[PDB]
Amino acid sequence: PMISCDMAYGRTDEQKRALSAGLLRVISEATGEPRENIFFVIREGSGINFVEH
Amino acid sequence: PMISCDMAYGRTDEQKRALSAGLLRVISEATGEPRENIFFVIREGSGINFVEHGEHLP
Amino acid sequence: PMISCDMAYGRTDEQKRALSAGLLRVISEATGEPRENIFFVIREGSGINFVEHGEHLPD
Amino acid sequence: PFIECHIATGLSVARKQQLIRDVIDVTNKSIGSDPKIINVLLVEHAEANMSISGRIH
Amino acid sequence: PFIECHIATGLSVARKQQLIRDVIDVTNKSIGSDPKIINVLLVEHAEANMSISGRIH
Amino acid sequence: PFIECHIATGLSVARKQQLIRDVIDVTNKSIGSDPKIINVLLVEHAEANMSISGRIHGE
């Protein structure tokens, strides 16, 4: 699997590690693929670069 | 819906507001979906990171 | 065609040129599309932003 | 630039081609990019494969 | 945020729906995002179209 | 790294598999990545759904 998250800049390295641990677990459990088989990238930007509702 | 735009650094805040507004409007009209149902992200990079017409950008 | 590469910061412009030349050649040859029709973007991030083989990358 | 748009399945081919045309137009008019350098990718998905604002279809 | 997940085809509709529910929950718990700004796209692919760990299917 | 390739539908499965092999090799040779951490995704689209350089399929 390959997972990406585009999100506002500002989260701590600890929060990012929590994010990845959760996403890796849930994707791994749903697909049945080992955590080592799931790639994850976080892409960050400032607020002018996001329109969220 | 979800919209992303990968482009070079340098656009003004005014230009990015025009872009997001123009994009959300056309996607909303095409899909019947309200503007609030449309995620948008701009992802910026420097010239070396883009290859257009087979050449890296300045 | 449109190609993207998400990778860790740190590659030189020379490496990025090698990478693009190689990808455009292989995609063009596989696809039958001219090189000028193949858009390529590289997206860079710091180590904490990547998880590969189960672990966040160092810088 | 490269604009990638993810929408639900259900539009006609005509409508989608008009959408692409209009994306190119608005990108040109607001950030100033020549149509010659604008790339657009439209991808359609089943509603079940998308969550807008934490909502499950 | 926008979380895009590329997985192999093969899951039930029920399983994918749970996966989207689980992605939303995890995102909210870990980085504090209101589910109202959490957007999820699940994309399925043939195994031949993907390589993980350099492996050709 | 993660390479995502968007191309037109029309390639055979054999041809697609070699393309993926070739992307992995190009990436390893240019950027140094262990092939085991090079992830490649190939996505095929109808021509009508892609515009390169402002062009509309047909016209």
Domain residue spans in chain C? 1-59
Task: For the domain covering A1-53, report its CATH number.
Answer: 3.30.429.10
DSSP per-residue codes, E1-55: -EEEEEEES---HHHHHHHHHHHHHHHHHHH---GGG-EEEEEEE-GGGEESTT-
Compute the 3-state secondary structure of chain F and give helix, strand, coil in percent, each to the nearest 5: 40, 25, 30
Under CATH, which architecture does the E1-57 domain have? 2-Layer Sandwich (3.30)
Of the partner residues A45, A48, A52, the one whose CB lies closest to the CB of residue B39: A52
Task: For the domain covering F1-59, report its CATH number.
Answer: 3.30.429.10
Q: Which two tokens stand for residue F57?
A: 């399929």
What resolution (Å)? 1.9
Task: For the domain covering C1-59, report its CATH number.
Answer: 3.30.429.10
Q: Do C26 and F6 touch (CB under 8 A)?
A: no
- Chain E neighbors of A37, CB-CB under 8 A: 52-53
Which residues, 6 or more positions from E30, have their beta carbon under 8 angstroms from its beta carbon? A15, A18, A19, A21, A22
Look up residue B42 and give its amino acid. I
CATH 3.30.429.10, domain B1-58, yes or no: yes
Mutate to test the interface with D, among F43, F51, F52 (most CBs of D within 10 A): F51
Per-window interface: B 2-31 vs E, CB < 8 A: 2, 4
DSSP per-residue codes, C14-51: HHHHHHHHHHHHHHHHHH---GGG-EEEEEEE-GGGEE
- Chain A neighbors of F4, CB-CB under 8 A: 2
Please give, rounded to a whole number of angstroms, the shortest distance from the CA of F58 to a CA of chain D: 10
Closest-CA residue of C relative to B54 is C36
DSSP per-residue codes, D20-45: HHHHHHHHHHHT---GGG-EEEEEEE
Residue F27 is classified by DSSP as: H
Of the partner residues B7, B26, B33, the one whose CB lies closest to the CB of residue D23: B26
How was it solved?
X-ray
Distance, CA of E29 to CA of A18 (rounded, Å): 9
